[PDB]
Design a protein around this ligand. Structure first.
Ligand SMILES: [Cl-]
Ligand SMILES: [Cl-]
Ligand SMILES: [Xe]
Length: 162
């Protein structure tokens, strides 16, 4: 298992514009296109992202291309974030993937605000962190996903993904 396979599981793959859980126009493997309710806007963002007139439809490769770019951006966001970096660098490989997953989902910003959990994580207080993490809108809005990520963070293994 790895970060790619893990998020491919959490996000799925859709070759046509769709609305995510928040109602936002998305494509491929969780690639957000726009927060705007305009489908045309969304289609405009897609064409821009791909470099062609997609008509709101892309290939599997196209989708995996966007995915890679997105996973890369998520880690670089973490490494550039003053609050995130030190946590990340303190973690083992599996727990680092859990962190990247959250940032992919919620953005740098979103995650940099989990101050309390971030601290417990740095102290290696797995259980407490896990509990603090579940006290969030994130857990209450996508609980099965949140559970998987949290268990990963808590244990350091991929069992939630078997
Ligand atoms: Cl893009
Ligand atoms: Cl979920
Ligand atoms: Xe965290």
């Amino acid at each position: 298992m790895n970060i790619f396979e893990m998020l491919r599981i959490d996000e799925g793959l859709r070759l046509k514009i769709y609305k995510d859980t928040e109602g936002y126009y998305t494509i491929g493997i969780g690639h957000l296109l726009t927060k705007s309710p305009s489908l045309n806007a969304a289609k405009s963002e897609l064409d821009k992202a791909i470099g062609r007139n997609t008509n709101g439809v892309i290939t599997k490769d196209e989708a995996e291309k966007l995915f890679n770019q997105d996973v890369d951006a998520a880690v670089r966001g973490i490494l550039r974030n003053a609050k995130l970096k030190p946590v990340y660098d303190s973690l083992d490989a599996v727990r680092r993937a859990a962190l990247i997953n959250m940032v992919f989902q919620m953005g740098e910003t979103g995650v940099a605000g989990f101050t309390n959990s971030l601290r417990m994580a740095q102290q290696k207080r797995w259980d407490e962190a896990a509990v603090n993490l579940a006290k969030s809108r994130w857990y209450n809005q996508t609980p099965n996903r949140a559970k998987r990520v949290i268990t990963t963070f808590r244990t350091g293994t991929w069992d939630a993904y078997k």
